[PDB]
Amino acid sequence: PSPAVVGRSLVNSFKQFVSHVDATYRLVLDCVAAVDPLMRLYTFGSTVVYGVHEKGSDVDFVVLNKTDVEDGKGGDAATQVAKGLQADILAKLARVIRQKHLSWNVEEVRRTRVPVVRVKGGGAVDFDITAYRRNGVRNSALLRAYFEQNPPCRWLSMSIKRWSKQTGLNASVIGGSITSYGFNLMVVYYLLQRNHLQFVPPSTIDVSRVEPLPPHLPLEEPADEGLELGTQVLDFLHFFLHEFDSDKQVISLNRPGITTKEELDWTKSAEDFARMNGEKVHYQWCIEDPYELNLNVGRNVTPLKRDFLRRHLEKARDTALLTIV
Ligand SMILES: Nc1ncnc2c1ncn2[C@@H]1O[C@H](COP(=O)(O)OP(=O)(O)OP(=O)(O)O)[C@@H](O)[C@H]1O
Ligand SMILES: [Mg+2]
Ligand SMILES: [Mg+2]
């Protein structure tokens, strides 16, 4: 199918979408304050990246102390005491949330690299809360700043996120390998490679200068019937099938141009040595996190999952991202 054909199907799939977070922010701050009236609440993830809250997305929150915010560019400790501190505050908050909302499922999730409290309330009211960490707010502000440069590119990212959840590529599905955040990094990397975006050094993002709850950023339908959308989608798929060399290169926002696996030591010798979360890291599909030290966002992409990804990338061309029936 042509770009126009693809663009039409896609604009056609979001028509229901085009036809809010304040109060949830406040409900959560009611809980945070009950634990500690000096603790701040910051928002991040898709709500922040896009400036729009999608149906079927959660909200990401983090609790910060005043001194965490003032150290606006500090890194996050990856130590066992940092994690102990985060668990301790989150336990307390979790207990307050259950008190104040008897009907919510409040899960203290301990599977993970970062301690998290996952709350499902029923009114499709879904959110993750973490503590004492800037990196989530910084990476979302970074991505936001990129999409603020070229607002219509959010439709490419939004199209790629939905497709990834529908094909089982997205980590939110059983067998999935790459988070939504991972996909965003890929979209922006691609856009940078094609000059649809101007490079932003990750170090220039300062948490002491971000909004706890950033303003909404209007999203308008593609007015060209989606020609540019459809063109961007096919080019994105071509790029990641035929241009990006997954054997030699890293999807990275830390520098403009090419980052190699060799300069990071993201090699077969490193996999033998390299563990994370208590399991193997893979370096088959490499996505450098712009803030965390030595973190491959594609660490779960085994050779099999890398196979699955390529196949779905190939297949997405003919079906316009699963939109042609
Ligand atoms: N693979 C990963 N490695 C490290 N950090 C991650 C990873 N995936 C997500 N995160 C963190 O979680 C935050 C939110 O990520 P998430 O995958 O939920 O993306 P999202 O854009 O909020 O999309 P969704 O609509 O799926 O919620 C990110 O800012 C990032 O800090
Ligand atoms: Mg999210
Ligand atoms: Mg998530």
Swiss-Prot record:
Signal peptide: none annotated. It catalyses: RNA(n) + UTP = RNA(n)-3'-uridine ribonucleotide + diphosphate. Mg(2+) binds at D58, D60. It comes from the Eukaryota. RNA binds at R113. The keyword Manganese applies. Binds 1 Mg(2+) or Mn(2+) per subunit. The type of divalent cation used by the enzyme affects the nucleotide specificity; Mg(2+) induces predominantly uridine (U) incorporation while Mn(2+) also induces substantial incorporation of both adenine (A) and cytosine (C). GO terms for biological process: RNA 3'-end processing. One of its GO terms (cellular component) is kinetoplast. Terminal uridylyltransferase which, specifically, catalyzes the addition of Us to the 3'-hydroxyl group of single-stranded RNAs with a 3'-terminal U. This is Terminal uridylyltransferase 4.
